Amino acid sequence: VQEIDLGLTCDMHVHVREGAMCELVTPKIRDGGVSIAYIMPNLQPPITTLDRVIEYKKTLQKLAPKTTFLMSFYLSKDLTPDLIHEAAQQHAIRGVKCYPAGVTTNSAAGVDPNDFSAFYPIFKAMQEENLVLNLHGEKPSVHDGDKEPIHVLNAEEAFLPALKKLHNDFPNLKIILEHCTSESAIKTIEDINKNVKKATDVKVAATLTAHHLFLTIDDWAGNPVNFCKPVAKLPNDKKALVKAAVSGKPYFFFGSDSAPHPVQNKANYEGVCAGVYSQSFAIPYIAQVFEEQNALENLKGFVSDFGISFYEVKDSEVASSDKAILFKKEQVIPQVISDGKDISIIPFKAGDKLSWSVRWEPR
Amino acid sequence: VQEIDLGLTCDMHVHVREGAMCELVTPKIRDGGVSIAYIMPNLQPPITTLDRVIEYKKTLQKLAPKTTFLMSFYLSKDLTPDLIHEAAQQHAIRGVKCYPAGVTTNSAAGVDPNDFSAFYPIFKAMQEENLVLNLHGEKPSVHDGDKEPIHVLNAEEAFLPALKKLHNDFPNLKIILEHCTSESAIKTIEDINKNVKKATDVKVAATLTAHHLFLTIDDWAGNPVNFCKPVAKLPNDKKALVKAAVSGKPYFFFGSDSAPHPVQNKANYEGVCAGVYSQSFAIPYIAQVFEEQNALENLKGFVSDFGISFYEVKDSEVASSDKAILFKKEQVIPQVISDGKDISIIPFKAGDKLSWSVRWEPR
Ligand SMILES: [Zn+2]
Ligand SMILES: [Zn+2]
Ligand SMILES: [Zn+2]
Ligand SMILES: [Zn+2]
């Protein structure tokens, strides 16, 4: 009977794919309790053109008229400063997402994070247009050479100097280290923000997923359903992520990285697709964590206030003014989420009970 | 063509299952270049009785008359010291294998390695009969009682105190740390053997697989076919394992832990079976490593002399005197190993090339 008014919830890291998969998952954004979604661009082929980002958003708006969609480009050599200015002036994108080549789904067309200088004309134009630079901050793996080996466990830590250099060279660019998974990165974000007093001072933030608040290496060792990028790491990393999430600091906010794959793309003996599907119960998953940490009073900031502030979402842009209301009615996560045709997805924590449910209230 | 006479090769950690899988796999020990095989006991039900170990070996000899089979008991709750004496006097077993409960394939009937004391009567009986104690040295995972958590990454290291205590309390017992995967374990095996001048001084040895000389956590993160227990760990660990393998030291020798699973037991979204199948090309896999390390002169020790010496294999036990001849005829590993009815196995490094082949010549 207990209720929590979360206002206009934000999930600032969403994958919704194309085709029938997109038709299945895009309505689940609302169902999971999320009013505003930042849409990632790693389609096959990636979103690097204006007409395609415009059509994609309209496709999503058609599937979910009440959901507010913030769009992005895929960082590529095909981008030009002129296209960035055009797209921004037309309100076609709110940011550009960087995938290092080879580290995750549809990242083959991505960048080498040692030569970020080649994209400085893009970053310079983004800075002028007040667009957000989103980073999948992992260095590609390297096991030889003069230098310390890079592997799936330290690839995020190895990326942190690139983050600092970018922030140094573009001090007015808004940058997000997406889905932080390590204690090292959490401290780097806090240290970057030492001189910050009010939320609007934040230039560099980090998003935290639902699943990295629960998972450890043991949970995906032998369970491809829990396998994602960046990989879930050690218990002390999980502890640092949970403390960051409930900290009340304005530079940590929710981005699910809900990444749907059909079940047959997870049940492979080689080349398992990375990604965990959390859209259907996004806010209830987070509520579980905030309850367990006795920190429900900080929930609204993490899943609403801080993301709205960082992305500067105006009320004149929101597709619906309905507020997400959390109510303490227990539910069971289904075993599968299916369109009743050719697509079955295994949802995060399939079979488990959640203490909270979410509904929508006008006004 | 370059040739090396490896003599009577031994693989001191072999899984051959039962039924049709056994019929497929047991002839491959020889085909893979191995003369002597130590047969692990984690069948359903585990091998804990005298008649079953006898019938099993007799089944294996029918399938491969020229292979020398050294047999084992599963360390289990219904095993007794008398059975240890009876089994040894009949030469029905050469050792007893310990599985910590829940840690790997068919280990549900295994032990709690925090309280080994209930098995000390077994160990004392093993000590008198000069039997080998084989250890899957991993402590089961714990994420609760805030003493340190242990997970798939540190579970081997967390077992190392248990190994030392067992060695201390039974100084005349031959003990093997099977399939070592971490630098920590290598150092501990070295420390225990600080004062050994010749092979017959070795009481505590360590076995090394083929796959852990190639694999890193990066190789199995998205590839269940490369998932095994203990998991392949970091580049620094693999570097320690490779160095140990080619070191020429008598306390390191080859044990493949070739662990066959049908392909559908690897292509799961959860509950992927742990194990890598290396039997078909066991010796050629190892040769590759020794060539790349410019240490082919140490190959014979690693795959023959040291295992024969530690297990004290006599010419009177050997099923065939044929010698394994390694010859540098390049070959390609197939994509599948199949019996042509219900069983397909994905071999280690499937599709790759090896510099060497193996053949058999009479003495
Ligand atoms: Zn990502
Ligand atoms: Zn993502
Ligand atoms: Zn084992
Ligand atoms: Zn084994």
Coordinates of N, CA and C in Angstrom, one line a residue, chain A residues 228-351:
Chain A
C228 N 27.4 -9.6 -20.0 CA 27.2 -8.3 -20.6 C 28.6 -7.6 -20.7
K229 N 28.7 -6.5 -21.4 CA 29.8 -5.6 -21.4 C 29.4 -4.2 -20.8
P230 N 30.3 -3.6 -19.9 CA 31.5 -4.2 -19.3 C 31.0 -5.4 -18.4
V231 N 31.9 -6.4 -18.3 CA 31.5 -7.6 -17.5 C 31.3 -7.2 -16.1
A232 N 30.4 -7.9 -15.4 CA 30.3 -7.7 -13.9 C 31.6 -8.3 -13.3
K233 N 32.1 -7.6 -12.3 CA 33.4 -7.8 -11.8 C 33.3 -8.4 -10.3
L234 N 34.1 -7.9 -9.4 CA 34.2 -8.5 -8.1 C 33.3 -7.9 -7.0
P235 N 33.1 -8.7 -5.9 CA 32.3 -8.1 -4.9 C 32.6 -6.7 -4.4
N236 N 33.9 -6.4 -4.3 CA 34.2 -5.0 -3.8 C 33.7 -4.0 -4.9
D237 N 33.8 -4.4 -6.2 CA 33.3 -3.5 -7.2 C 31.8 -3.3 -7.1
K238 N 31.1 -4.4 -7.0 CA 29.6 -4.3 -6.7 C 29.3 -3.4 -5.6
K239 N 30.1 -3.4 -4.5 CA 29.8 -2.6 -3.3 C 30.0 -1.2 -3.6
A240 N 31.1 -0.8 -4.3 CA 31.3 0.6 -4.7 C 30.2 1.1 -5.6
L241 N 29.7 0.3 -6.5 CA 28.6 0.7 -7.4 C 27.3 1.0 -6.6
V242 N 27.0 0.1 -5.7 CA 25.7 0.3 -4.9 C 25.8 1.6 -4.1
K243 N 27.0 1.8 -3.4 CA 27.2 3.0 -2.6 C 27.1 4.2 -3.5
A244 N 27.7 4.2 -4.7 CA 27.5 5.3 -5.6 C 26.1 5.5 -6.0
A245 N 25.3 4.4 -6.2 CA 24.0 4.6 -6.7 C 23.1 5.3 -5.7
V246 N 23.3 4.9 -4.4 CA 22.4 5.5 -3.3 C 23.1 6.7 -2.6
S247 N 24.2 7.2 -3.2 CA 24.9 8.3 -2.6 C 24.2 9.6 -2.6
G248 N 23.3 9.8 -3.5 CA 22.7 11.2 -3.6 C 23.7 12.2 -4.3
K249 N 24.7 11.7 -4.9 CA 25.6 12.6 -5.7 C 25.0 12.8 -7.1
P250 N 25.0 14.1 -7.6 CA 24.3 14.4 -8.8 C 25.1 13.8 -10.1
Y251 N 26.3 13.2 -9.9 CA 27.0 12.7 -11.1 C 26.9 11.2 -11.3
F252 N 25.9 10.6 -10.6 CA 25.6 9.2 -10.8 C 24.1 9.1 -11.0
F253 N 23.6 8.6 -12.1 CA 22.2 8.4 -12.4 C 22.0 7.1 -13.2
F254 N 20.7 6.7 -13.3 CA 20.3 5.4 -13.9 C 20.4 5.4 -15.4
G255 N 21.1 4.4 -15.9 CA 21.0 4.0 -17.3 C 21.1 2.5 -17.4
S256 N 20.0 1.9 -17.8 CA 19.9 0.4 -17.6 C 20.9 -0.4 -18.5
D257 N 21.3 0.1 -19.6 CA 21.9 -0.7 -20.7 C 21.1 -2.0 -20.9
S258 N 19.8 -1.8 -20.8 CA 18.9 -3.0 -21.2 C 19.2 -3.2 -22.7
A259 N 19.7 -4.5 -23.0 CA 20.2 -4.8 -24.3 C 19.5 -6.1 -24.7
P260 N 18.4 -6.1 -25.4 CA 17.7 -7.3 -25.7 C 18.3 -8.1 -26.8
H261 N 18.3 -9.5 -26.6 CA 18.8 -10.5 -27.5 C 17.8 -11.6 -27.5
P262 N 17.4 -12.2 -28.7 CA 16.6 -13.4 -28.6 C 17.3 -14.5 -27.9
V263 N 16.6 -15.4 -27.3 CA 17.2 -16.4 -26.4 C 18.2 -17.2 -27.2
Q264 N 18.0 -17.5 -28.5 CA 18.9 -18.3 -29.2 C 20.2 -17.6 -29.5
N265 N 20.3 -16.3 -29.3 CA 21.5 -15.6 -29.4 C 22.3 -15.6 -28.1
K266 N 21.6 -16.0 -27.0 CA 22.4 -16.2 -25.8 C 22.8 -17.7 -25.6
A267 N 22.1 -18.6 -26.1 CA 22.4 -20.0 -25.9 C 23.3 -20.6 -27.0
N268 N 24.5 -20.0 -27.1 CA 25.4 -20.4 -28.1 C 26.6 -21.0 -27.4
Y269 N 27.3 -22.0 -28.1 CA 28.5 -22.5 -27.4 C 29.7 -21.6 -27.8
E270 N 29.6 -20.7 -28.8 CA 30.7 -19.7 -29.0 C 30.0 -18.4 -29.5
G271 N 30.6 -17.3 -29.2 CA 30.1 -16.0 -29.7 C 28.8 -15.6 -29.1
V272 N 28.6 -15.9 -27.8 CA 27.4 -15.5 -27.1 C 27.3 -13.9 -27.2
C273 N 26.1 -13.5 -27.4 CA 25.8 -12.0 -27.5 C 25.9 -11.4 -26.1
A274 N 26.6 -10.3 -25.9 CA 26.6 -9.6 -24.6 C 25.4 -8.8 -24.4
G275 N 24.8 -8.8 -23.3 CA 23.6 -8.0 -23.0 C 22.6 -8.6 -22.0
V276 N 22.1 -7.8 -21.1 CA 21.1 -8.3 -20.1 C 19.8 -7.4 -20.4
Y277 N 18.7 -8.1 -20.4 CA 17.4 -7.4 -20.7 C 16.7 -7.0 -19.4
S278 N 16.6 -5.7 -19.1 CA 16.0 -5.2 -17.9 C 14.9 -4.3 -18.1
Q279 N 14.5 -4.0 -19.3 CA 13.5 -2.9 -19.5 C 12.2 -3.1 -18.9
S280 N 11.7 -4.4 -18.9 CA 10.4 -4.7 -18.5 C 10.1 -4.4 -17.0
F281 N 11.2 -4.4 -16.2 CA 11.1 -4.1 -14.7 C 12.1 -3.1 -14.2
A282 N 12.5 -2.2 -15.1 CA 13.7 -1.3 -14.8 C 13.6 -0.7 -13.5
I283 N 12.6 0.1 -13.2 CA 12.6 0.9 -11.9 C 12.3 -0.1 -10.8
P284 N 11.4 -1.1 -10.8 CA 11.3 -2.0 -9.7 C 12.7 -2.7 -9.4
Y285 N 13.5 -3.1 -10.4 CA 14.8 -3.6 -10.0 C 15.6 -2.7 -9.2
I286 N 15.6 -1.4 -9.5 CA 16.4 -0.4 -8.8 C 15.8 -0.2 -7.4
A287 N 14.5 -0.2 -7.3 CA 13.8 0.0 -6.0 C 14.3 -1.1 -5.0
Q288 N 14.4 -2.3 -5.5 CA 14.9 -3.4 -4.6 C 16.2 -3.1 -4.0
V289 N 17.2 -2.5 -4.8 CA 18.5 -2.2 -4.3 C 18.3 -1.1 -3.2
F290 N 17.6 0.0 -3.6 CA 17.5 1.1 -2.7 C 16.8 0.8 -1.4
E291 N 15.8 -0.2 -1.5 CA 15.2 -0.7 -0.2 C 16.2 -1.4 0.6
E292 N 16.9 -2.3 0.0 CA 17.9 -3.1 0.8 C 19.0 -2.3 1.4
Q293 N 19.3 -1.1 0.8 CA 20.3 -0.2 1.4 C 19.7 0.8 2.4
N294 N 18.4 0.7 2.7 CA 17.7 1.7 3.5 C 17.9 3.1 3.0
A295 N 17.7 3.3 1.6 CA 18.0 4.5 1.0 C 16.9 4.9 0.0
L296 N 15.7 4.5 0.3 CA 14.5 4.9 -0.6 C 14.4 6.4 -0.8
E297 N 14.8 7.2 0.2 CA 14.7 8.6 0.0 C 15.6 9.2 -1.1
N298 N 16.6 8.4 -1.5 CA 17.5 8.9 -2.6 C 17.1 8.3 -3.9
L299 N 16.0 7.5 -4.0 CA 15.6 6.8 -5.2 C 15.3 7.8 -6.3
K300 N 14.5 8.9 -6.0 CA 14.0 9.8 -7.0 C 15.2 10.5 -7.7
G301 N 16.2 10.9 -6.9 CA 17.3 11.6 -7.5 C 18.0 10.7 -8.5
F302 N 18.2 9.4 -8.2 CA 19.0 8.5 -9.1 C 18.3 8.2 -10.3
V303 N 17.0 7.9 -10.3 CA 16.2 7.5 -11.5 C 15.4 8.6 -12.1
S304 N 15.5 9.9 -11.6 CA 14.8 11.0 -12.2 C 15.6 12.3 -12.2
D305 N 15.8 12.9 -11.0 CA 16.3 14.3 -10.9 C 17.6 14.5 -11.6
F306 N 18.6 13.6 -11.3 CA 19.9 13.8 -11.8 C 20.1 13.6 -13.3
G307 N 19.3 12.7 -13.9 CA 19.4 12.6 -15.3 C 18.7 13.7 -16.1
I308 N 17.5 14.2 -15.6 CA 16.9 15.3 -16.1 C 17.8 16.5 -16.1
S309 N 18.5 16.8 -15.0 CA 19.4 17.9 -14.8 C 20.5 17.8 -15.8
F310 N 21.2 16.6 -15.9 CA 22.4 16.5 -16.7 C 22.0 16.7 -18.2
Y311 N 21.0 16.1 -18.7 CA 20.6 16.2 -20.0 C 19.7 17.4 -20.3
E312 N 19.4 18.2 -19.3 CA 18.6 19.4 -19.4 C 17.3 19.2 -20.2
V313 N 16.5 18.2 -19.7 CA 15.3 17.8 -20.4 C 14.2 18.9 -20.0
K314 N 13.6 19.5 -21.0 CA 12.6 20.6 -20.7 C 11.3 19.9 -20.7
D315 N 10.4 20.5 -19.8 CA 9.0 20.0 -19.8 C 8.3 20.3 -21.2
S316 N 8.8 21.2 -21.9 CA 8.2 21.4 -23.2 C 8.5 20.2 -24.2
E317 N 9.5 19.4 -23.8 CA 9.8 18.3 -24.7 C 9.2 17.0 -24.3
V318 N 8.6 16.8 -23.1 CA 8.2 15.5 -22.6 C 6.9 15.1 -23.3
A319 N 6.9 13.8 -23.9 CA 5.8 13.3 -24.6 C 4.6 13.1 -23.7
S320 N 4.8 12.9 -22.4 CA 3.7 12.7 -21.5 C 4.1 13.2 -20.1
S321 N 3.2 13.9 -19.4 CA 3.4 14.4 -18.1 C 3.0 13.4 -17.0
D322 N 2.6 12.2 -17.4 CA 2.3 11.2 -16.4 C 3.5 10.9 -15.5
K323 N 3.2 10.7 -14.2 CA 4.3 10.5 -13.2 C 4.3 9.0 -12.9
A324 N 5.5 8.5 -12.8 CA 5.7 7.0 -12.4 C 5.5 6.9 -10.9
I325 N 4.6 6.1 -10.5 CA 4.4 5.8 -9.0 C 4.7 4.4 -8.7
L326 N 5.7 4.2 -7.8 CA 6.1 3.0 -7.2 C 5.1 2.6 -6.1
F327 N 4.6 1.4 -6.1 CA 3.7 0.9 -5.0 C 4.2 -0.5 -4.6
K328 N 4.1 -0.7 -3.3 CA 4.8 -1.9 -2.7 C 3.9 -3.1 -2.8
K329 N 3.6 -3.5 -4.0 CA 2.9 -4.8 -4.3 C 3.9 -5.8 -4.9
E330 N 4.1 -6.9 -4.2 CA 5.1 -8.0 -4.7 C 4.7 -8.5 -6.1
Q331 N 5.7 -8.8 -6.9 CA 5.4 -9.5 -8.2 C 6.5 -10.5 -8.5
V332 N 6.3 -11.3 -9.4 CA 7.2 -12.4 -9.9 C 7.6 -12.0 -11.3
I333 N 9.0 -12.0 -11.5 CA 9.4 -11.8 -12.9 C 9.2 -13.0 -13.7
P334 N 8.6 -12.9 -14.9 CA 8.3 -14.1 -15.8 C 9.6 -14.8 -16.2
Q335 N 9.4 -16.0 -16.8 CA 10.6 -16.7 -17.2 C 11.1 -16.2 -18.6
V336 N 10.1 -15.6 -19.4 CA 10.4 -15.2 -20.7 C 9.6 -14.0 -21.0
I337 N 10.1 -13.1 -21.9 CA 9.3 -12.1 -22.4 C 9.2 -12.3 -23.9
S338 N 8.0 -12.4 -24.5 CA 7.9 -12.9 -25.8 C 6.8 -12.1 -26.6
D339 N 7.0 -12.0 -27.9 CA 6.0 -11.3 -28.7 C 4.9 -12.3 -29.2
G340 N 5.0 -13.6 -28.8 CA 4.1 -14.6 -29.3 C 4.3 -14.9 -30.8
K341 N 5.4 -14.5 -31.3 CA 5.8 -14.9 -32.7 C 7.1 -15.6 -32.7
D342 N 8.2 -15.0 -33.1 CA 9.5 -15.6 -33.2 C 10.5 -15.2 -32.1
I343 N 10.1 -14.3 -31.2 CA 11.1 -13.7 -30.3 C 10.7 -14.0 -28.9
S344 N 11.7 -14.7 -28.2 CA 11.6 -14.8 -26.7 C 12.9 -14.2 -26.1
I345 N 12.7 -13.4 -25.1 CA 13.9 -12.9 -24.4 C 13.8 -13.3 -22.9
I346 N 15.0 -13.7 -22.4 CA 15.0 -14.0 -20.9 C 15.3 -12.8 -20.2
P347 N 14.4 -12.3 -19.3 CA 14.6 -11.1 -18.6 C 15.5 -11.3 -17.4
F348 N 16.1 -10.2 -17.0 CA 17.0 -10.2 -15.8 C 16.3 -10.7 -14.6
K349 N 17.0 -11.6 -13.8 CA 16.4 -12.1 -12.6 C 15.1 -12.9 -12.8
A350 N 15.0 -13.5 -14.0 CA 13.8 -14.3 -14.3 C 13.5 -15.3 -13.2
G351 N 12.2 -15.3 -12.8 CA 11.7 -16.1 -11.7 C 11.8 -15.5 -10.3

